[PDB]
C-alpha cells in the first residue's frame, strides 16, 4: 500500500484528537495535513527532523517523490468527480531562504513559492493567504488562518488545500425524520436518506462494528463504521481499538461481500476548525514547536525558525445526490447512532477525509 505512512499517521492523529474532543462531531483531511507537514519536514534537521519522520510514520529516503506521485494520482483528471489537492508556500519578501529548499519544495509539492509582507503588513498577508485557500476550496474554507495567527515575526506559511465534489454511484431517496441516538440521555431528530442497493458490507468482529462501502461515481468511496457499548456515543471501543491492520483488511482487501443492503444514513453537514500544535506535540513532535530547540536549517541556513502552529479547517456536506421490494430478511445498515466515516481514494488507498458523526 503506497499510502501506508499517511494512513498510520491519520489513525494516530485521530486518536490523539479524540482525547481533546471525545464525543462531538470531528472532521478533518489527514491527506491535507500529511502534505503540509511533509513540506515542513523537508526544511527540518537534527532532532526536529528525526521526530517529524517518526510522527508522520515515514520510519514504518524517497518520501518527497512518494508525495508527488500520490498527489498526481489524486489530481488525475476524471469526468466522475471534482477532486483537487494543491500546495502553496507564502514567504516573507525580505527573508532569504535556502535555494535548495525553495527548488525542492516546488519540484515535489508544486507549491509555487510566493513573496508576501509579513514583516510590515501581516494582516494583509493573512487575508491574501485566506483568500487563496478560499478560491482553491470553491468558497468552502473562507478564513483558514484566524485573527492573530500571523504577525511581523512570521516568515513562511506552508499551505495545502483539498477540494472534493462527487455524486453517489446510486442516489439516495430523502425520506420525506428519525430519532438519532446521541447518547444514553439524548435523542435528536435527523433527516434520513434511504437506499436499497447491491453494496459491499461486512462486520469487523475485533471492533464490534458493521462496515459499509458507499461508492461515488469513479474510484472514490465513503466507508462507514457503525458500532453495534457505552452510555455516551457508543464509539469508545471502536475508536480505541481501530488500527491500520484491522481497517485495511476490510477497506482494501476483499473481506467485504456484496449483498442487497437497505441503508439509512443521515443527511448532514460539518465544519470544524483545529489548532494542532498540542496534538502534534502529544504525538512526539516536540522540537518543531519549541522556539529554542527547533532546527529548520533546511529552510534557512541561519537556523532562526520554529513552527508556531498548524491551523486546519475542514467541511463536508453529505446529501442524496447521485421498486416493489417488501422483504426485510437481509442486511440493514441503520446509522441512527454515532459512527466513524472516511473518504478513500481507491487508486492510492489514501484517506482523503476522516470523521466522527455523533451530533445532528
Amino acid at each position: 500500500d503506497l499510502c501506508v505512512a499517511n494512513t498510520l499517521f491519520a489513525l494516530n492523529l485521530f486518536k490523539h484528537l479524540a482525547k481533546a474532543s471525545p464525543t462531538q462531531n470531528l472532521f478533518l483531511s489527514p491527506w491535507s495535513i500529511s502534505s503540509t507537514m511533509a513540506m515542513v519536514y523537508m526544511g527540518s534537521r537534527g532532532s526536529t527532523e528525526d521526530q517529524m519522520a517518526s510522527v508522520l510514520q515515514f520510519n514504518e529516503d524517497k518520501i518527497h517523490s512518494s508525495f508527488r506521485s500520490l498527489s498526481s494520482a489524486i489530481n488525475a483528471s476524471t469526468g466522475n468527480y471534482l477532486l483537487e489537492s494543491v500546495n502553496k508556500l507564502f514567504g516573507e519578501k525580505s527573508a532569504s531562504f535556502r535555494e535548495e529548499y525553495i527548488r525542492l519544495c516546488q519540484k515535489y509539492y508544486s507549491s509555487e513559492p510566493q513573496a508576501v509582507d509579513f514583516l510590515e503588513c501581516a494582516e494583509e498577508a493573512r487575508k491574501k493567504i485566506n483568500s487563496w485557500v478560499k478560491t482553491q476550496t470553491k468558497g468552502k474554507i473562507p478564513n483558514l488562518l484566524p485573527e492573530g495567527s500571523v504577525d511581523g515575526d512570521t516568515r513562511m506559511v506552508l499551505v495545502n488545500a483539498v477540494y472534493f465534489k462527487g455524486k453517489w454511484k446510486t442516489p439516495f431517496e430523502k425520506k420525506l425524520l428519525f430519532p438519532f441516538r446521541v447518547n444514553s440521555a439524548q435523542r435528536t431528530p435527523v433527516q434520513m436518506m434511504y437506499l436499497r442497493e447491491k453494496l459491499n458490507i461486512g462486520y469487523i468482529e475485533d471492533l464490534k462494528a458493521q462496515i459499509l462501502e458507499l461508492p461515488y461515481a469513479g474510484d472514490v468511496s465513503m466507508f462507514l463504521l457503525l458500532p453495534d457499548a457505552d452510555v455516551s456515543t457508543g464509539l469508545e471501543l471502536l475508536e480505541s481499538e481501530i488500527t491500520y491492520d484491522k481497517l485495511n483488511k476490510w477497506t482494501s482487501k476483499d473481506k467485504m461481500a456484496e449483498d442487497e443492503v437497505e441503508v439509512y444514513i443521515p443527511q448532514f453537514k460539518l465544519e470544524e476548525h483545529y489548532e494542532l500544535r498540542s496534538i502534534l506535540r502529544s504525538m512526539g513532535m516536540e522540537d518543531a514547536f519549541n522556539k529554542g530547540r527547533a532546527n529548520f536549517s533546511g529552510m534557512s541556513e541561519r537556523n532562526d525558525l520554529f513552527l508556531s502552529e498548524v491551523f486546519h479547517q475542514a467541511m463536508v456536506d453529505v446529501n442524496e445526490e447521485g421498486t416493489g421490494r417488501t422483504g426485510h430478511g437481509g442486511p440493514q445498515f441503520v446509522a441512527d447512532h454515532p459512527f466513524l466515516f472516511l473518504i478513500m481514494h481507491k487508486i492510492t488507498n489514501c484517506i482523503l477525509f476522516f470523521g466522527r458523526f455523533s451530533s445532528p
Binding site: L28, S32, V159, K291, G292, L307, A314, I343
Partner: peptide
C-alpha cells in the same frame, strides 16, 4: 458529497 479542507503551517522567526 462536497468536502474541503485547508491546512496552514506557520513558520515564525526567532
Amino acid at each position: 458529497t462536497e468536502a474541503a479542507a485547508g491546512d496552514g503551517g506557520v513558520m515564525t522567526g526567532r
